[PDB]
Structures are given as structure tokens and as C-alpha cells.
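Re-running the complex after MR caught last week's input typo. The corrected sequence lines follow. Everything else is unchanged.
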Amino acid sequence: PQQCDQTFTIATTDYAMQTILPFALPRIYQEAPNVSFNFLPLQHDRLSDQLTYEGADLAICRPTGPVEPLRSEILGRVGVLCLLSKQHPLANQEMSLDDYLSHPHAMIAISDGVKALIEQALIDKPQRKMVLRAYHLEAALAIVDTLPIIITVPADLAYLVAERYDLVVKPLPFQFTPFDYSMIWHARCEHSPAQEWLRSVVREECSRLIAK
Amino acid sequence: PQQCDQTFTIATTDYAMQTILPFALPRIYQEAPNVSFNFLPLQHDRLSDQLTYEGADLAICRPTGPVEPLRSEILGRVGVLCLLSKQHPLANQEMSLDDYLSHPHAMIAISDGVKALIEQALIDKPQRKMVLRAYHLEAALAIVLPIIITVPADLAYLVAERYDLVVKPLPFQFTPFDYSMIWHARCEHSPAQEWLRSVVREECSRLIAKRIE
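Corrected-run output:
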């Protein structure tokens, strides 16, 4: 509704902050011109307490475990991509796993759960140089003019961003099973008309996102 | 030095992560090629827990209070600035307090503690409508509604620049807060930590200069 004027508190990881949410927002405000949002950083380890006492109506992440009795739902499957400066040696050719391993790495907006996922997928091949780990590729960009860093990001951020910081997108050189991104909420928000609305729009929008 | 291949954990805010360190990073890696970095979100109420228990080497933020027995030094003086879309009504005029107070507000990259600072500066004024409160700014971007985007000064200039939008001063008296480095006594006399801090120190220093000009 347009007569909705309440403020929804979403707890977000940095990834969902830069891709999912902003994608969703034009349509949220379009449908609900009057709704305020409050986006606070999700603490993965105090996820259930954020939703219970700290005022969060919805958390958008990838739980590092089960979350019951918090109700939950997969939004879809995020994949992982690599970002290269257009002036990277590899910017032009194709990335073999052997390229990937011989170059310095910046890890942007992954997080340890997925980091562990990737590290797990890279379990037998030789230790790569992990040079930077951050949640803002502003920071990796800062060094594309220094190291030939390969920037591993969730796939969706590569598409939202690469095509504007003037850097290129290469596929992962190895077997990566896309992980699942979820919404979490307290069962008490389970039948709230406004909360069903939020989750719906966030659900449909993630579709439009995944579909494209 | 440059034998150093040790990794540093820096717990940091968003502002710090977009305006400071990106700035300070090229001289770091140039100065210590083997060095490795780990930046993670500061959790402001867990500042000391983060440096003490979670393995954070240094914290860069505005501590919402006294940090003893955590080591700390001021870095410099963050101020707050506004960002408008180039097709915002007030884009080509000066924005008066009244104008400020009549428009939807999007508050980016501002800590609660600083949020409280501005709330306290606007304490005798009508309520404004706070339509959006995020931490990366690609969310406000997404809706830049005739919103006025409040942000730490340096960040305003950084993106105002390249997202073609405009920068209006705060239509009120607001006195710059200051940012700082924070660390555990345990990192006070580490040759590598004393080194990290100083490169941060003189790059921040360097940043003020450049900016001041």
C-alpha cells in the first residue's frame, strides 16, 4: 500500500546491501512511497537476537547454520565471479585455474561462510596469495594499479559494478556450486500484513534479479 | 619494512572503508609488497571486544565513548555534507534550513554516535522525514524521491563527483566530530603494528592536507 508509512528494519550483510536491496528499492518506494527503511549490518552470530530484541523485522543473508525457530526461506542461488582491471595481464585472455593461482587475490564481499565454501572447493590446489579481504570493492579498486589482483566477488556484484568501474568479468576457473541466499524473520512477524508485503516484494524482486 | 608478509586485521566503518583506506592503501602495498589485509565491519558496541577477542589489530572509527584501556589517537576531523540529485529541486539554489526540513532524508554511512550528534544539533527543529538509513550508499543512489542524502563530508565529494549529483552544506551549525585509530595495548609495542599505524597516520595526515587545500 501507499498508505503505509512505517519503517522496516532490515539487517543486511554487505553483499545484500550493494546488490539485492538497492535493486529492490525503486520498486519498494514506487509501490510504497511512504515507507522508511532502516538498514543495519547483520551480525551473523547474533542473527536470532537481532530479530528478537534489537528491532530487526527481516534479516537477509546466508545463515551459517540452522535458524529454527526463526522462519526462513531461500531467495535464490548466488554464484561467484572474478573481476579484473581492464589493464590486467589477463583482462584479454581466458582464466585458467593456473592463471588464478599465480596472481594475488583481493576477496570482496564474500564472507567466511562462502570463503570456506570456496577454500573448500580449492582444497587440493596450491595456496594462492590472499592479499586483501574487504567488503567494499572501493578498496580493491584502490590497488588495481599496484598488484595484478584478481577480484573474486559474488556474481551479482560483478554485473552491477564491473560495467562502470571499467573492469572486466571472468568466470571462476574451477568447480563452484552456487550457494543459497536467504531471508530470515521471527515467527512473530509471520502474519503481519506489512511484513508479508515486504517479504513478498523482496521475494519477487530477487526473482527479477535472478532471472536477469 | 618489506620482509613483512604478515596480515593485518582492521575493523572499520563504511566511511573509513570508502574514503580513507582506499586512499591509504596504494602507499601501503607499495611500501610492503608482501603484506596482506583483512578489513571487516566494525560493530561499534563491540569495538573493544573486537580488538580484544576477535583478533582485530587496529580499529578505525569514532568510538561512541572513552576507550580505556584501549590505545587510541585522533586521526582527523570528519564533517557532514549533503548530496542531491542534479534534478533535485534545490540542486541549483542554496538549501536553507527550512528547505532541508521539508524534504525526505536519506542518511548514508553515518554512525549512530554521529547520528546522535546531528539529531542533537537539530534538537529544537521540526522532525524531518528519514526515508532511508543505509551504510553502503548504492542504496540511496538507487532512489536518488526528492531525497537529500546526508553523508560524511569526504564521501560526498568522492561520489558527488562521479555520480553526477550535487553537494550542499548542512543548513545548520554542526561541529566536525573526529575519527581515530583504536588498538589493544597488546599491539602497542609491535614493530609491525607501530608501523601500520604510522602509515595510516601519515596517509590520513596526507588526506587532510590534500583536502584542506
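None of the earlier attempt is carried over here. Strands of chain A lie at 7-12, 36-41, 58-61, 71-78, 80-85, 105-108, 130-134, 150-154, 167-171, 179-185. The domain at 1-78+179-212 of chain A is CATH 3.40.190.10 (D-Maltodextrin-Binding Protein; domain 2).
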